[PDB]
């Protein structure tokens, strides 16, 4: 049912649909090493992707409803030169008629132009002053639907944000070729990332778009804060979703020392451009593969690994005493050889029992395969210590709201631009 589906292949980009759209790329188009299927577009002229469809699938009707889906990653806007700088990322307008998606400061805009110059705009606005954002430098699943009789709707991660009637619009023409390029950007260091572009010749409903989001979310693969693939042997800062104003810290080395949530986080500010919180605070949590037989560095679901903690640029190991008081027992970082038989195995969990994707969680287990439980935090004498217990699993069995069993991995990224 898809007309265009740009999917990576052996050092090229092909179309999954049975239409054979011509695809040509520039010499300055970059690709991620681990996740090649995502494409980086930089502010230049040669950084261009042209895709030519067939004349039998060119949008030239008036009652024809259509939709499309993609994943987009927009870095943070750093200076005032990005204000009021509406620039186009994807253009399908010829002779002043077509559909076009474009980006402004904290804005993603879908524009429809008919043969009668009429403009209809659907706008998704995300703030840049928030402490922790779900959109700034993070992958966003953006789709639009366009029903020529009722409305045009924007979906971000499968949820309604905005809708605008398009009944007044007449006949809308479309270009034979589709453009992937930053057009009209005055910022010379501005780039975006895009992947999984799909086009459909009808208005999609909530159920189909949610199914698409789940299918392309790669629920069986771990994800970090930015939405990329989780990897071994890479330092990650820690974030607790239910306590996002504190970071993991250590006090003493060994069992006698405890890892706790220290606060508050700092801020990064540029005087009416952004007032975000610092994500590069705390101690780094490296992941070391233990029993995963996969050759690649990507971390998958149900993997059994070990966790190292970087303290004064020295790698220690996660461990806890299995036999002590209570189930809410204290975790610690100790020297790598001196663990002995202390519990170190952690199972990575991304998707639940029913298969619904959720944020990454770590399950501490012993050598005997007995579940210590999900790693969380609990308050001892006003101090939030890292505790692994089966209480979170008890709430999961009871379908209750767990408190403290979700984590986010923040690696250093160039789209955030915070000094370390």
């Amino acid at each position: 049912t898809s007309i265009l589906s740009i999917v990576y292949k052996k050092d090229d980009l092909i179309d999954l649909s049975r239409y054979g759209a011509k695809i040509n790329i520039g010499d300055r188009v970059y690709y991620d090493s681990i996740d090649k299927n995502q494409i980086k577009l930089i502010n230049l002229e040669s950084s261009t992707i042209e895709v030519i469809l067939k004349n039998a699938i060119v949008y030239n009707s008036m009652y024809e409803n259509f939709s499309t889906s993609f994943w987009i990653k927009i870095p943070k806007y750093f200076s005032k030169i990005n204000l009021n700088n509406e620039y186009t990322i994807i253009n399908c307008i010829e002779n002043n008629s077509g559909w076009k998606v474009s980006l402004n400061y904290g804005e993603i805009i879908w524009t429809l132009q008919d043969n009668k110059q009429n403009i209809q705009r659907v706008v998704f606005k995300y703030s840049q002053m928030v402490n922790i954002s779900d959109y700034i430098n993070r992958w966003i699943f953006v789709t639009i639907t366009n029903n020529r009789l009722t409305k045009s709707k924007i979906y971000i991660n499968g949820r309604l944000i905005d809708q605008k009637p398009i009944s007044n619009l007449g006949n809308i023409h479309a270009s034979n070729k589709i453009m992937f390029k930053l057009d009209g950007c005055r910022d010379p260091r501005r780039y975006i990332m895009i992947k999984y572009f799909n086009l459909f010749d009808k208005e999609l409903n909530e159920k189909e778009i949610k199914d698409l989001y789940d299918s392309q979310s790669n629920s069986g693969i771990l994800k970090d804060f930015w939405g990329n693939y989780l990897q071994y042997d890479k330092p990650y800062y820690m974030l607790n979703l239910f306590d996002p104003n504190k970071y993991v810290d250590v006090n003493n080395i060994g069992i006698r020392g405890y890892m706790y949530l220290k606060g508050p986080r700092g801020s990064v500010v540029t005087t009416n451009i952004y007032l975000n919180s610092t994500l590069y605070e705390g101690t780094k949590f490296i992941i070391k593969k233990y029993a995963s037989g996969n050759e690649d560095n990507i971390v998958r679901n149900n993997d059994r690994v070990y966790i190292n903690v970087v303290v004064k640029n020295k790698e220690y190991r996660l461990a806890t005493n299995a036999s002590q008081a209570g189930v809410e027992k204290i975790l610690s970082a100790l020297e790598i050889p001196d663990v002995g038989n202390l519990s170190q195995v952690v199972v990575m969990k991304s998707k639940d029992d029913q298969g619904i994707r959720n944020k990454c969680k770590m399950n501490l287990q012993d050598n005997n395969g007995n579940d210590i439980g999900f790693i969380g935090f609990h308050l001892y004498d006003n101090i939030a210590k890292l505790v692994a217990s089966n209480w979170y699993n008890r709430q999961v069995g009871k379908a209750s709201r767990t408190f403290g069993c979700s984590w986010e991995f923040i690696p250093v990224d160039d789209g955030w631009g915070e000094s370390s």
Binding site: V268, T271, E281
Partner: protein, 110 residues
């Protein structure tokens, strides 16, 4: 109070670059300064006001200030580590790419 204002010193057009500092200042106004890649570690500022100044790639650490303000000041790529320079001490100022880390505890107002 009025006598205190009378004894206030004024320092115009002051350039400092690539210098490390600890000092205690009291009852001064520094106007039109220009500081580049300076490290300000452990300084006490009482009734000291910086006006029309420019700090670029500077570094503040362990800064404590009472009745200190940065009015008409511009900060570029500067880092405030372990300081109590809260947001009410920057009056009509412009911070660019500036980071506040490990802020000291204090009341929201003066």
């Amino acid at each position: 109070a009025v006598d205190y204002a009378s004894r206030t010193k004024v320092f115009p057009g002051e350039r400092v670059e690539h210098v490390t500092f600890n000092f205690t200042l009291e009852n001064q106004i520094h106007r039109g300064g220009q500081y580049f890649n300076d490290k300000f570690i452990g300084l006490r500022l009482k009734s000291v006001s910086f006006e029309d100044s420019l700090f670029e790639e500077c570094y503040f650490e362990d800064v404590t200030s009472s009745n200190t303000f940065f009015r008409n000041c511009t900060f570029i790529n500067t880092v405030f580590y372990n300081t109590d320079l809260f947001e009410y001490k920057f009056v009509n100022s412009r911070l660019i790419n500036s980071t506040f880390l490990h802020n000291k505890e204090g009341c929201p107002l003066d």
